[PDB]
């Protein structure tokens, strides 16, 4: 009945975050649209917005990697783009020392909140480092909205 | 028309967690009030409660820091205080910068759940170490409720 979406990362899309709804246990209904990898708000109102991303790497590089994940709003009325929800994670404090085992690491990031949105607004679930994204298994990376 | 809240950390308040609603993409409506930095429940019912906090530091100190974040309920009927949702993070698993100079770390904490609350109940988003909080950018630290 109410505008819903629960889009999942496309496992077919190599090294990039592409949202997909044409899958089992995924939603896009009651006006919610997926245009240019963004969720389009069908009507004015309160929406619960959420997203999860899972990062994976093998060992630690010389560069101090900072993994970020945000849900941004493009408000069509003002033609403005802002970050509604954002989180940062540092997976590596120290680089793997001299011929050591490049042990796999995993970092989940969850974002969620209630926001008053306007009809036509575009929400994006963005990551600065998509090459660190893990969509090997279902349920690890998703982005959704629900009108309340 | 349902009781709502999505308060955000005041960037003007230095080294402390002060909730604010008088901002864009922030909510406080339909009975929900923000007094003495807490959210007061306006009516009996089920509420989705959520909060996010982002902790940041520049290297690791001598003390073993444990960062905690909880949503507590003061139930006015019984004059009792309990932790509804809680999470703990250890940012520095020893890894003290000995020799060279510090690199920034980031730790996000998300809490969310559905609870039956009573009118007049006071909800607090509490952190043991507010000095580690990061509100440099919008969407990093928030606290909210919505009646279902």
């Amino acid at each position: 009945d109410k505008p819903v979406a629960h889009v999942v990362a496309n496992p077919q899309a190599e090294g990039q975050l592409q949202w997909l709804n044409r899958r089992a246990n995924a939603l896009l209904a009651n006006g919610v649209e997926l245009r240019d990898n963004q969720l389009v708000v069908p009507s004015e109102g309160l929406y619960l917005i959420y997203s999860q991303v899972l990062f994976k790497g093998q060992g630690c590089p010389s560069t101090h990697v900072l993994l970020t994940h945000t849900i941004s709003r493009i408000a069509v009325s003002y033609q403005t783009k802002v970050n509604l929800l954002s989180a940062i994670k540092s997976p590596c404090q120290r680089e793997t020392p001299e011929g050591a085992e490049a042990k796999p690491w995993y970092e989940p990031i969850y974002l969620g909140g209630v926001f008053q949105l306007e009809k036509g607004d575009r929400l994006s679930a963005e990551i600065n480092r998509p090459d660190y994204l893990d969509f090997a298994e279902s349920g690890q990376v998703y982005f959704g909205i629900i009108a309340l | 028309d349902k009781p709502v809240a999505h308060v955000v950390a005041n960037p003007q308040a230095e080294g402390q967690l002060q909730w604010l609603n008088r901002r864009a993409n922030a909510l406080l409506a339909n009975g929900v009030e923000l007094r003495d930095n807490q959210l007061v429940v306006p009516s009996e019912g089920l509420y989705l409660i959520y909060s996010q906090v982002l902790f940041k530091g520049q290297g690791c100190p001598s003390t073993h820091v444990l960062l905690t974040h909880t949503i507590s309920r003061i139930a006015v009927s019984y004059q009792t205080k309990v932790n509804l949702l809680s999470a703990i993070k250890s940012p520095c698993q020893r890894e003290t910068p000995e020799g060279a100079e510090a690199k920034p770390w980031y730790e996000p904490i998300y809490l969310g759940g559905v609870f039956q609350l009573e009118k007049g109940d006071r909800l607090s988003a509490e952190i043991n170490r507010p000095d580690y909080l990061d509100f440099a950018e919008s969407g990093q630290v928030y606290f909210g409720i919505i009646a279902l």
Epitope: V82, S124, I127, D131 | -
Partner: nanobody, 121 residues
């Protein structure tokens, strides 16, 4: 993170212009890099951004189809190709970088260039 713009100046209306921005610092692959502009007496606006290896691209609706943003990760340089310039494009153009997507409400975790003037007509 330090940002230095180049290009700009004057162009006749309907003309073209290209701006560059060179970044210096540690792990620049973590940053979204982009462009803002601010016209005299008008509010500062985000034009767009590009993250490492061009995985995220954003264009403000008003410049979509005429402005192109590109990134050279070997040179740590971003470019703003501006076509069919109109008098309303007269502003100071600023290069910006942030580990979070750039926003029309920038915070203390966004780095800025010195700004470059572009005058159209």
């Amino acid at each position: 993170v330090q940002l230095v713009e180049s290009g700009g100046g004057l162009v006749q209306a309907g003309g073209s212009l290209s701006l560059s921005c060179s970044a210096s610092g540690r792990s620049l692959s973590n940053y979204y890099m982009g462009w803002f502009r601010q016209a005299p007496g008008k509010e500062r606006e985000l034009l767009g951004n590009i993250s490492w290896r061009g995985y995220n691209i954003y264009y403000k609706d008003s410049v979509k189809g005429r402005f192109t943003i590109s990134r050279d990760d070997a040179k740590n340089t971003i470019y703003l190709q501006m076509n069919r310039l109109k008098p309303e494009d007269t502003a100071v153009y600023y290069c910006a970088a942030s580990i979070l997507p750039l926003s029309d409400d920038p915070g203390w975790n966004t780095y800025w260039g010195q700004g470059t003037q572009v005058t159209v007509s």
